[PDB]
Design an enzyme around this catalytic site. Structure first.
Site, PDB file in Angstrom:
ATOM      1  N   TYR A  95      40.680  33.454  37.746  1.00 46.61           N
ATOM      2  CA  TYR A  95      41.548  34.115  38.697  1.00 46.61           C
ATOM      3  C   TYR A  95      42.996  34.168  38.177  1.00 46.61           C
ATOM      4  O   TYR A  95      43.619  35.232  38.185  1.00 46.61           O
ATOM      5  CB  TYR A  95      41.463  33.382  40.042  1.00 46.61           C
ATOM      6  CG  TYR A  95      42.405  33.925  41.086  1.00 46.61           C
ATOM      7  CD1 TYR A  95      42.142  35.131  41.735  1.00 46.61           C
ATOM      8  CD2 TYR A  95      43.558  33.228  41.442  1.00 46.61           C
ATOM      9  CE1 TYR A  95      43.023  35.643  42.695  1.00 46.61           C
ATOM     10  CE2 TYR A  95      44.431  33.720  42.414  1.00 46.61           C
ATOM     11  CZ  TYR A  95      44.155  34.924  43.039  1.00 46.61           C
ATOM     12  OH  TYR A  95      45.014  35.392  44.000  1.00 46.61           O
TER      13      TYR A  95
ATOM     14  N   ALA B   8      43.984  33.757  34.978  1.00 45.55           N
ATOM     15  CA  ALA B   8      43.987  34.577  33.755  1.00 45.55           C
ATOM     16  C   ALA B   8      44.191  36.059  34.087  1.00 45.55           C
ATOM     17  O   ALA B   8      45.052  36.710  33.498  1.00 45.55           O
ATOM     18  CB  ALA B   8      42.687  34.382  32.984  1.00 45.55           C
TER      19      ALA B   8
ATOM     20  N   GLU C  20      41.071  35.239  56.450  1.00 39.34           N
ATOM     21  CA  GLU C  20      39.801  34.543  56.671  1.00 39.34           C
ATOM     22  C   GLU C  20      39.203  33.971  55.390  1.00 39.34           C
ATOM     23  O   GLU C  20      38.734  32.833  55.388  1.00 39.34           O
ATOM     24  CB  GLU C  20      38.799  35.448  57.399  1.00 39.34           C
ATOM     25  CG  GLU C  20      39.192  35.766  58.836  1.00 39.34           C
ATOM     26  CD  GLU C  20      38.125  36.452  59.668  1.00 39.34           C
ATOM     27  OE1 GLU C  20      38.453  37.469  60.322  1.00 39.34           O
ATOM     28  OE2 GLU C  20      36.967  35.969  59.675  1.00 39.34           O
TER      29      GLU C  20
HETATM   30  N1  LIG Z   1      45.134  35.292  51.061  1.00 42.54           N
HETATM   31  C1  LIG Z   1      45.793  34.494  50.193  1.00 42.54           C
HETATM   32  O1  LIG Z   1      45.893  33.257  50.363  1.00 42.54           O
HETATM   33  C2  LIG Z   1      46.354  35.110  48.942  1.00 42.54           C
HETATM   34  C3  LIG Z   1      47.227  34.337  48.186  1.00 42.54           C
HETATM   35  C4  LIG Z   1      47.820  34.858  47.052  1.00 42.54           C
HETATM   36  C5  LIG Z   1      47.537  36.144  46.664  1.00 42.54           C
HETATM   37  N2  LIG Z   1      46.689  36.905  47.381  1.00 42.54           N
HETATM   38  C6  LIG Z   1      46.340  38.310  46.852  1.00 42.54           C
HETATM   39  O2  LIG Z   1      46.228  39.188  47.925  1.00 42.54           O
HETATM   40  C7  LIG Z   1      45.245  40.216  47.665  1.00 42.54           C
HETATM   41  C8  LIG Z   1      44.319  40.354  48.848  1.00 42.54           C
HETATM   42  O3  LIG Z   1      43.799  39.047  49.173  1.00 42.54           O
HETATM   43  P1  LIG Z   1      43.211  38.712  50.605  1.00 42.54           P
HETATM   44  O4  LIG Z   1      43.326  37.250  50.800  1.00 42.54           O
HETATM   45  O5  LIG Z   1      43.813  39.615  51.614  1.00 42.54           O
HETATM   46  O6  LIG Z   1      41.656  39.058  50.408  1.00 42.54           O
HETATM   47  P2  LIG Z   1      40.358  39.346  51.309  1.00 42.54           P
HETATM   48  O7  LIG Z   1      40.492  39.213  52.775  1.00 42.54           O
HETATM   49  O8  LIG Z   1      39.148  38.636  50.729  1.00 42.54           O
HETATM   50  O9  LIG Z   1      40.085  40.881  50.955  1.00 42.54           O
HETATM   51  C9  LIG Z   1      39.909  41.385  49.617  1.00 42.54           C
HETATM   52  C10 LIG Z   1      39.505  42.831  49.731  1.00 42.54           C
HETATM   53  O10 LIG Z   1      38.983  43.305  48.465  1.00 42.54           O
HETATM   54  C11 LIG Z   1      37.747  43.959  48.668  1.00 42.54           C
HETATM   55  N3  LIG Z   1      36.911  43.797  47.476  1.00 42.54           N
HETATM   56  C12 LIG Z   1      36.204  42.687  47.098  1.00 42.54           C
HETATM   57  N4  LIG Z   1      35.425  42.875  46.061  1.00 42.54           N
HETATM   58  C13 LIG Z   1      35.639  44.206  45.726  1.00 42.54           C
HETATM   59  C14 LIG Z   1      35.096  45.039  44.720  1.00 42.54           C
HETATM   60  N5  LIG Z   1      34.232  44.625  43.780  1.00 42.54           N
HETATM   61  N6  LIG Z   1      35.507  46.326  44.686  1.00 42.54           N
HETATM   62  C15 LIG Z   1      36.413  46.739  45.577  1.00 42.54           C
HETATM   63  N7  LIG Z   1      37.001  46.046  46.555  1.00 42.54           N
HETATM   64  C16 LIG Z   1      36.561  44.782  46.585  1.00 42.54           C
HETATM   65  C17 LIG Z   1      37.181  43.403  49.974  1.00 42.54           C
HETATM   66  O11 LIG Z   1      36.371  44.369  50.673  1.00 42.54           O
HETATM   67  P3  LIG Z   1      34.810  44.583  50.422  1.00 42.54           P
HETATM   68  O12 LIG Z   1      34.233  43.176  50.423  1.00 42.54           O
HETATM   69  O13 LIG Z   1      34.226  45.281  51.635  1.00 42.54           O
HETATM   70  O14 LIG Z   1      34.661  45.293  49.164  1.00 42.54           O
HETATM   71  C18 LIG Z   1      38.438  43.127  50.787  1.00 42.54           C
HETATM   72  O15 LIG Z   1      38.812  44.262  51.563  1.00 42.54           O
HETATM   73  C19 LIG Z   1      44.570  39.812  46.363  1.00 42.54           C
HETATM   74  O16 LIG Z   1      45.093  40.561  45.270  1.00 42.54           O
HETATM   75  C20 LIG Z   1      44.903  38.327  46.282  1.00 42.54           C
HETATM   76  O17 LIG Z   1      44.975  37.862  44.939  1.00 42.54           O
HETATM   77  C21 LIG Z   1      46.096  36.407  48.532  1.00 42.54           C
HETATM   78  C1  LIG Z   2      40.144  33.838  47.490  1.00 42.81           C
HETATM   79  O1  LIG Z   2      41.373  33.395  46.962  1.00 42.81           O
HETATM   80  C2  LIG Z   2      42.516  33.993  47.568  1.00 42.81           C
HETATM   81  C3  LIG Z   2      43.451  32.825  47.928  1.00 42.81           C
HETATM   82  N1  LIG Z   2      44.304  33.223  46.808  1.00 42.81           N
HETATM   83  C4  LIG Z   2      45.412  32.682  46.261  1.00 42.81           C
HETATM   84  O2  LIG Z   2      46.001  33.222  45.337  1.00 42.81           O
HETATM   85  C5  LIG Z   2      45.943  31.394  46.846  1.00 42.81           C
HETATM   86  C6  LIG Z   2      45.695  30.082  46.039  1.00 42.81           C
HETATM   87  C7  LIG Z   2      44.133  30.059  45.848  1.00 42.81           C
HETATM   88  C8  LIG Z   2      43.515  30.810  44.850  1.00 42.81           C
HETATM   89  C9  LIG Z   2      42.134  30.937  44.786  1.00 42.81           C
HETATM   90  C10 LIG Z   2      41.381  30.267  45.709  1.00 42.81           C
HETATM   91  F1  LIG Z   2      40.022  30.396  45.664  1.00 42.81           F
HETATM   92  C11 LIG Z   2      41.928  29.482  46.680  1.00 42.81           C
HETATM   93  C12 LIG Z   2      43.309  29.381  46.742  1.00 42.81           C
HETATM   94  C13 LIG Z   2      46.442  30.063  44.673  1.00 42.81           C
HETATM   95  C14 LIG Z   2      47.962  30.153  44.878  1.00 42.81           C
HETATM   96  C15 LIG Z   2      48.453  28.955  45.689  1.00 42.81           C
HETATM   97  C16 LIG Z   2      48.140  27.665  44.929  1.00 42.81           C
HETATM   98  C17 LIG Z   2      46.630  27.559  44.714  1.00 42.81           C
HETATM   99  C18 LIG Z   2      46.144  28.766  43.907  1.00 42.81           C
HETATM  100  C19 LIG Z   2      45.926  27.539  46.071  1.00 42.81           C
HETATM  101  C20 LIG Z   2      46.223  28.846  46.831  1.00 42.81           C
HETATM  102  C21 LIG Z   2      47.742  28.933  47.039  1.00 42.81           C
HETATM  103  C22 LIG Z   2      43.531  34.423  46.492  1.00 42.81           C
END
Ligand SMILES: NC(=O)c1ccc[n+]([C@@H]2O[C@H](COP(=O)([O-])OP(=O)(O)OC[C@H]3O[C@@H](n4cnc5c(N)ncnc54)[C@H](OP(=O)(O)O)[C@@H]3O)[C@@H](O)[C@H]2O)c1
Ligand SMILES: COC1CN(C(=O)C[C@]2(c3ccc(F)cc3)[C@H]3C[C@@H]4C[C@H](C3)C[C@H]2C4)C1
Ligand SMILES: NC(=O)c1ccc[n+]([C@@H]2O[C@H](COP(=O)([O-])OP(=O)(O)OC[C@H]3O[C@@H](n4cnc5c(N)ncnc54)[C@H](OP(=O)(O)O)[C@@H]3O)[C@@H](O)[C@H]2O)c1
Ligand SMILES: COC1CN(C(=O)C[C@]2(c3ccc(F)cc3)[C@H]3C[C@@H]4C[C@H](C3)C[C@H]2C4)C1
Lengths: 262, 273
Positions: free
Chosen positions: A158, A160, A196
């Protein structure tokens, strides 16, 4: 200073917009009166998002379902989305492959899948979107993480893919600056967000504060609209203060007097 | 045989000595020319057992011969392409069988690259990620059991373009940044899993190798550092089990490259999982 009217009538793509941060971005853009094209794999969930986008006041709202594992789908999606809207102002690259907190042992499969979905598909979507973006002097919004700037265990694949986003998009941003390409690139470095998926993934193991998905989605839109190079959004004020690398920006400015492109 | 002991005593985490590599079993990738070849030459002088790899059988043969002349305990080559993940996996097994184990894995090869503006060259983006990053992951997976046995070292050769942004190296930079994200994350994992295998990320500036000089000609105007000393500095870091090595012509670059805020954030977040 951001104004919601900056997105009124704008043609925006949002990837991974069936749930989490992506869905929230579509909702804010809809409220702002933007034209939206949402994508993810689930047709049924995308349909619901499109319906509430129209209810919120979106100028137009469409979905195109498919997987970002397929580079052909990624390329065709952008052409179809651009044809539906008659152009493109903002490309929001948000989708990621399903991931969890696990030690790396020998799962080269998960490393390859993360590189393909989280990084290579963003490159293909950018290539497909760029001619229209050059026409509108638009923006590219790349959603990353703290794990895309600093090292953490249990997220090797992730991390990388998120680091690669930085290396690639920051390098072309420098190219656009010297080539006079008026296309902005916003890298969004995010901490824990109360989606979620993330809450389920950090249950028990991790002990840290989650920031609201609604405000996160708005902050991402703000940065893209303001043409900010980077956006930082985290619960902790210690994290937001330490995430910036001022020495990196100085090295780049020092090295900008070494090459010739004319 | 009727002898035992330890080279790594007091001061051995700070001051390097060539005897630290005497009898060590080392793999060097992309060692037919440039920095890789220079590393093989230094290791040979140190009396290490070496296994060199690159695609060119003919050039590798010449490197092997010069290594034996310099005093290498043993010197072998295995030719092949790192675009092939099967070859990468099998190479490590064969190298380990030739040497009877593995102490140090030096990941140095890259795909041929030039200074050009991004031009939707998708094949170059993919091949960069595959050769420069994914093969390093496969070589690591294959090498790890033997490295766990010897409390060995992984040396990953990266660039300034793997830490900061520069134009005309987008795909190359993506591949070098990915190494940092991947290897720095598993280093944290090894620390908590009690895996005594060190990981050295090497941050290099312009080096006077034939390839780099040819590629920068009339596009990049900056001071090149000598390949010989560069190769030695990489070996030093791996031997001292240093997390990172920095080698550049400018002293301003060596002072600004370090990210103290990054190391603080990591130490602050280590009390969360
Ligand atoms: N939430 C956090 O804690 C967090 C923290 C740091 C960064 N981020 C970044 O925020 C962004 C969104 O994260 P999120 O937490 O909102 O995620 P999330 O609720 O799991 O949603 C990810 C979305 O991507 C879609 N997806 C999954 N596999 C796919 C595939 N093969 N092709 C196309 N679409 C696909 C899913 O829909 P389908 O399953 O229906 O395809 C879903 O709509 C990501 O880039 C993540 O790295 C999130
Ligand atoms: C599904 O993951 C979604 C959540 N995402 C993050 O980017 C959040 C973090 C992570 C990364 C992957 C995981 F599976 C679980 C947590 C990442 C940034 C921060 C420090 C640690 C590494 C823990 C959290 C908060 C994409
Ligand atoms: N020189 C610099 O200025 C500079 C700066 C910063 C970092 N670095 C890093 O230093 C390392 C070495 O660079 P260098 O300048 O010494 O390069 P170089 O002389 O061009 O060497 C590259 C080596 O890799 C081999 N190789 C190429 N493609 C391969 C493939 N498909 N499979 C296997 N081996 C392959 C080459 O031999 P074959 O063609 O025979 O296979 C050669 O031995 C790289 O990691 C580079 O990123 C160099
Ligand atoms: C194959 O060439 C070898 C040379 N390599 C570098 O990494 C050196 C640099 C580069 C990158 C790729 C090129 F093709 C040419 C130069 C890189 C780091 C420094 C700033 C710039 C980007 C220019 C130099 C010096 C890989």
């Amino acid at each position: 200073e951001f104004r919601p009217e900056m997105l009124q009538g704008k043609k925006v793509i949002v990837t991974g917009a069936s749930k989490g941060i992506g869905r929230e971005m579509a909702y804010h853009l809809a409220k702002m009166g933007a034209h939206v094209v949402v994508t993810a794999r689930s047709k049924e969930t995308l349909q619901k998002v499109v319906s509430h986008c129209l209810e919120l006041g979106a100028a137009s709202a469409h979905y195109i379902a498919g997987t970002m594992e397929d580079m052909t789908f990624a390329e065709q999606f952008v052409a179809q989305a651009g044809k539906l809207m008659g152009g493109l102002d903002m490309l929001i690259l948000n989708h990621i492959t399903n991931t969890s907190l696990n030690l790396f042992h020998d799962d080269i499969h998960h490393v390859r899948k993360s590189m393909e979905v989280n990084f290579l598909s963003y490159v293909v979507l950018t290539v497909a979107a760029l001619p229209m973006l050059k026409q509108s002097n638009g923006s590219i919004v790349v959603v990353s993480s703290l794990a895309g700037k600093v090292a953490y265990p249990m997220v090797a694949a992730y991390s990388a893919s998120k680091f690669a986003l930085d290396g690639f998009f920051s390098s072309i941003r420098k190219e656009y600056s010297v080539s006079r390409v008026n296309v902005s690139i916003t890298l969004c470095v995010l901490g824990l967000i109360d989606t979620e998926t993330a809450m389920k993934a950090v249950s028990g193991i991790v002990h840290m504060q989650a920031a609201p998905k609604e405000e996160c989605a708005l902050e991402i839109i703000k940065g893209g609209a303001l043409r900010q190079e980077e956006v930082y959004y985290d619960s902790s004020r210690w994290t937001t203060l330490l995430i910036r690398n001022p020495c990196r920006k100085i090295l780049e400015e020092l090295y900008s007097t070494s090459y010739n492109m004319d």
